[PDB]
Amino acid sequence: TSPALRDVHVPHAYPEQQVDLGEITMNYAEAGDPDRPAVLLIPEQTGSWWSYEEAMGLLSEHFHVYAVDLRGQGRSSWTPKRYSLDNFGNDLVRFIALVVKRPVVVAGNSSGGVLAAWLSAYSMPGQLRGVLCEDPPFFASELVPAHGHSVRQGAGPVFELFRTYLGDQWSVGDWEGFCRAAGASASPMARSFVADGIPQHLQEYDPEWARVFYEGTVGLSCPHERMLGQVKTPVLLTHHMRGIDPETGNLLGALSDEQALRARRLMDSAGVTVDYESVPDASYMMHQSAPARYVEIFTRWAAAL
Amino acid sequence: PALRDVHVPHAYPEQQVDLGEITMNYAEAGDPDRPAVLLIPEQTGSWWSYEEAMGLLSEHFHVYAVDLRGQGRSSWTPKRYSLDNFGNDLVRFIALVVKRPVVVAGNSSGGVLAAWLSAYSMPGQLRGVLCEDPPFFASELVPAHGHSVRQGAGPVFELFRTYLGDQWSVGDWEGFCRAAGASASPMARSFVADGIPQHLQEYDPEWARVFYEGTVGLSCPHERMLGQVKTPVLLTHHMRGIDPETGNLLGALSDEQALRARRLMDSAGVTVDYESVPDASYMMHQSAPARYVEIFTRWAAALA
Amino acid sequence: VTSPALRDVHVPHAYPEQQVDLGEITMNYAEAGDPDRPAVLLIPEQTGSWWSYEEAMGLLSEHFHVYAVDLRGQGRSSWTPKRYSLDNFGNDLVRFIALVVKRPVVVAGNSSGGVLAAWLSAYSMPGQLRGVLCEDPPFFASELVPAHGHSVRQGAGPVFELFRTYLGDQWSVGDWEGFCRAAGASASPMARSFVADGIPQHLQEYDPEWARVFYEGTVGLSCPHERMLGQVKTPVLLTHHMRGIDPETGNLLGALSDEQALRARRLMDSAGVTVDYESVPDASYMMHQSAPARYVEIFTRWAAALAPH
Amino acid sequence: VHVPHAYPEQQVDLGEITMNYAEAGDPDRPAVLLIPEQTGSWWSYEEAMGLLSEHFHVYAVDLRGQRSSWTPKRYSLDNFGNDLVRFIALVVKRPVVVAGNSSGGVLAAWLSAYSMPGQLRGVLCEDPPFFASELVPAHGHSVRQGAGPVFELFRTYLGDQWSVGDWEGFCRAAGASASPMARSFVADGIPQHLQEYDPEWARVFYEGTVGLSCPHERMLGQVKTPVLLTHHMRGIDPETGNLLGALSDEQALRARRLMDSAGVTVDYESVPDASYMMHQSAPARYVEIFTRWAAALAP
Ligand SMILES: C[C@@H](O)CCCC(=O)CCC/C=C/c1cc(O)cc(O)c1C(=O)O
Ligand SMILES: C[C@@H](O)CCCC(=O)CCC/C=C/c1cc(O)cc(O)c1C(=O)O
Ligand SMILES: C[C@@H](O)CCCC(=O)CCC/C=C/c1cc(O)cc(O)c1C(=O)O
Ligand SMILES: C[C@@H](O)CCCC(=O)CCC/C=C/c1cc(O)cc(O)c1C(=O)O
């Protein structure tokens, strides 16, 4: 297995399509009847469009569904030195403008949920009808957050190992060294990656993603407080498992109760309807671990826009 | 300037468009059936930096001149100033207002953004770009080639950051003039004046911060942008030199930096025209409008 | 205001002032007590000069040979543009002990001075220190990217931002009017406290580049607190004064959180030293100045127990 | 990985670290302190020590991160420099003449400006990357246009405290580098001196943290002892525009101007045919230059 050669991809239930956005090619898949309201699905970090493979089938009964590979992931362009929230987000603006061509409901998981909120605030006018942020690391994914734990006290331990042992565009590729260091890590999420083989979704991932989160450059020019304070559409914030590790004090999960509270206050001050669904027993990737439950929450909220 | 009530009338009516995050102010001139042109001002310059050249270009072109975010009547956006946000604003402006392929001309930092659009616009948006005295590399904190911003315009930016401040929150013009008067940078000493120039009153000095601190282009290194340009490019290179007292760069970019930038743009496969005008000021479109429009029209006429 | 930028602001105090050339800088200091008694070094809080301790020095001089110092960028000590770092502050103090005190010392520091006392416990030359008192120290909370809890941006950072912008490096801006306007609009109670009664004398002696390097996270970039605390080599007393959470912002009030204190104590315990912890939640952060008798009581009680059995 | 050498080795506790060193010559003669280049141990000077020990009391040291303590997250010019201040005060206990090669010569200048008063009689800066080892220098080429390419490969393929240790991947990338210095490191086995090196050294130079709080122009403008600056091979690579050698002629001029304004005697010796480690590749030549200059210092 050689992720650096980008020859790792496998079949999926929907055909894969590509669009030139200008700087990058973005790979995506499509499901459902084009006469239905459009939905855009943005995956979690290290997740490709097919992170949503099962939920797409359920959602396609009611919506025209697009799921995308972000730059640095899947079959989309890898762009050294270019990974930032603003480049991710403007990629998605161009996708909506060039491919979807009608208003969309956007759902994103974790960093994808950060980008869904990015679009709510910063898309072109009228591109969006509402957004679902699925377990988003508001503040918790920033190096210098306005509120609560930083990324160094949450997912950063994992990103540090990715940066060191996998490297930009898999330039190091030391899977054995990664597993050795991960098995001895204080992060339960880090220890979770130790395996004989490389998970498929991680084979498709550009680990420079991890560098820009760990080093705090990905969001340097996009502070979360200013983004959250400027959303322009309804927002559903889903909040899954979270807790504090007694051994280290680090955050477990995507964001703390305090970070969720401050994020909700910020979006409420922007003048939009903010719904909050707390599912403390769910994994962060509910759209994949509990697809029917996720689609139930999604469709309930989508119907009331 | 902090209250943003300083604006005055101009030879053209001003229009505003909602791009999403920001409102963009601009002016329009010429016949809607002529080829479209987009003019991007230098740093601290509003759209009306191009007022004279617009008149001359409007005989042949449908001309748009814009205020970038943090300038003029466009939105001020604290903590958001980066090349990619400037650039994508302009992508949106072309898509929502111009709605036709455009020829883009940009002065200094506007010319960096002209090259940004050449490489990173949506497909087919651009026919070609004129980069008027662009500080390739020299406006970066850590350039691949040649002088850094700290050895170029950085001394000016340090003074703006310290004495004017983000969104004019400090606004110590007397303290700025005192310090600029004692600066080794000739460009800094050129701002000493009793009153605040009109263009600078409209300017958000957080601009100077993000250039001085190296954050504006952190996720947009110039060598990767220059190596991915996709349209014909005309690079005009105006006055430049070395100050013996400091070794600092005078002008927008050195001959070495122009050479390395042209090599990258050539490696991207595009036709790069290089016009060296070592007598001209960096803002030739304003100091010598007819000469600027001649160079522009000569080159634009030859585009497919 | 230009007087602070010209550094002609200094006034007399209760003790005469002395200077020593440490190499890069001149360090100003005051001395009290019997040279026959055990030596003590007092390190002020940020914006505080040696005379922050003036009253406590009188009380301590009864039983100790007391030295109180101006750090670089403060008081009459050298202002050093672009050189403000925990390592440069700390090595200044190492040289002061070596060149002036010439005896083992008990070190007591307030807030950032307490961070520097811990620095010395870990990183001084061998045998220079017998123990350190860390008076309300912002362990982790004065860092831009701490291992644990609140960052400086969620604590004292709002004050440092206003100092950086309106006072400026070496007081080059000096916009006190603008500072007060912005401060009166600030959510930080510490920020608002600086407005009344003009520019405090201690602040006029202060180089606000201090505030820049804390706000920008450069002061301790090469000196992470977790590695410092895990390598202390002397007994440590940590006094923990007022602290809480502001409901309006979630920001820390005080020097460090109870979580940060716990994690700091755990690291110092793992270093193999005796760690004492005294919680005084009703005290201001500068207890040595606001309640000198109470401070000297804590100090002397603990210093007595440093005596070998 | 450490091996025997021609001189016995000693260790001293400086506080945070233990410092390894070797000592040679008559303890009655004037003291000399030798600081290696980056990735160099004290025995970088082994042959030069023999020659110098006939007239001088010679000390050669391992800096932190090179048998001296490795100290993760603590590598900075000021921590390097204060280590040496402590070594002089605790070990040498007499004024010293200091010679340092490349980054060691940066530290020799550091000591001239920032040591404790009177610790130093003079410094020799052997091919020092003044400015050129900084991320944002006041003058000339930055580290990214000089030795940076090498440091980037060390950071990625070797890693902090050799935590990655992908020597094969390093050799592959180095052999294909446009930097001749990088290409020079390719070898089937790890050189002994590099086995002794903490590559977090390379990280802090590449990332510009090593000297963040120690800008070179303020250091050079505050030197307090005589300075000898030796300037070896240097040039421009036409393919990249990058600097070859330690510093440019422009950077040497700007450094000399600052040291002149500091108020000290500055001597400049241009040897454009010499490699940067003249004390190792041409020891007799190096000791001739040093012994001449040191004899002119006030006894
Ligand atoms: C490599 C990646 O799988 C590690 C993050 C997953 C995890 O910790 C589980 C708790 C949820 C945190 C998510 C999260 C947090 C971030 O700070 C950034 C992210 O992109 C995610 C993100 O997953 O996109
Ligand atoms: C007006 C002042 O605030 C900007 C500097 C003017 C000057 O030095 C004249 C020489 C040309 C370099 C310009 C320039 C250089 C940069 O590094 C960045 C810029 O935005 C410009 C820029 O003007 O956009
Ligand atoms: C006075 C002003 O300049 C600093 C504001 C101090 C304050 O909030 C009082 C509560 C305790 C925090 C202290 C503290 C905290 C830091 O992060 C850094 C410090 O140097 C101190 C420090 O005071 O040295
Ligand atoms: C990794 C090591 O090989 C360094 C590269 C040596 C080299 O290019 C030839 C000599 C010119 C530059 C030296 C130099 C330059 C720096 O910027 C920093 C250094 O520590 C040295 C230094 O060697 O100490």
Numbering used by the authors:
A (entry chain C): 3 to 307
B (entry chain D): 5 to 308
C (entry chain B): 2 to 310
D (entry chain A): 10 to 75, 77 to 309
Quote the study on this structure:
Zearalenone (ZEN) is a mycoestrogenic polyketide produced by Fusarium graminearum and other phytopathogenic members of the genus Fusarium. ZenA cleaves zearalenone [ZEN, (S,E)-14,16-dihydroxy-3-methyl-3,4,5,6,9,10-hexahydro-1H-benzo[c]oxacyclotetradecine-1,7(8H)-dione] to hydrolyzed zearalenone [HZEN, (S,E)-2,4-dihydroxy-6-(10-hydroxy-6-oxoundec-1-en-1-yl)benzoic acid], which decarboxylates spontaneously to decarboxylated hydrolyzed zearalenone [DHZEN, (S,E)-1-(3,5-dihydroxyphenyl)-10-hydroxyundec-1-en-6-one]. Furthermore, we report site-directed mutagenesis as well as structural analysis of the dimeric ZenARe of R. erythropolis and the more thermostable, tetrameric ZenAScfl of Streptomyces coelicoflavus with and without bound ligands. The X-ray crystal structures not only revealed canonical features of α/β hydrolases with a cap domain including a Ser-His-Asp catalytic triad but also unusual features including an uncommon oxyanion hole motif and a peripheral, short antiparallel β-sheet involved in tetramer interactions.
Of the site-directed mutants with a disrupted catalytic triad, ZenAScfl H286Y was used for the structural investigation of enzyme–substrate interactions. The resolutions for ligand bound and unbound structures were 1.53 and 1.92 Å, respectively. For ZenAScfl H286Y cocrystallized with ZEN, refinement was initially carried out with substrate ZEN modeled in the active site. However, the difference density map and a subsequently calculated Polder map revealed a better fit of product HZEN in the active site. The β-resorcylic acid moiety of HZEN was found in a well-defined position at the active site, while the open-chain hydroxyketone moiety appeared flexible. The aromatic side chain of Tyr-286 was positioned as in ZenAScfl H286Y without ligand, but OG of Ser-112 was rotated to occupy the created vacancy. The distance between the atoms that would be forming a covalent bond as a reaction intermediate in wild-type ZenAScfl, carboxylate C12 of HZEN, and OG of Ser-112, is 3.8 Å. However, this distance is only 2.1 Å when measured from the OG of naturally positioned Ser-112 of aligned wild-type ZenAScfl, which therefore appears reaction-competent. The side-chain amide group of Gln-47 as well as OG of Ser-113 form hydrogen bonds with the hydroxyl moiety bound to C2 of HZEN (2.8 and 3.2 Å, respectively). Nonpolar interactions with HZEN are formed by the residues Pro-139, Val-160, Phe-161, and Phe-164.
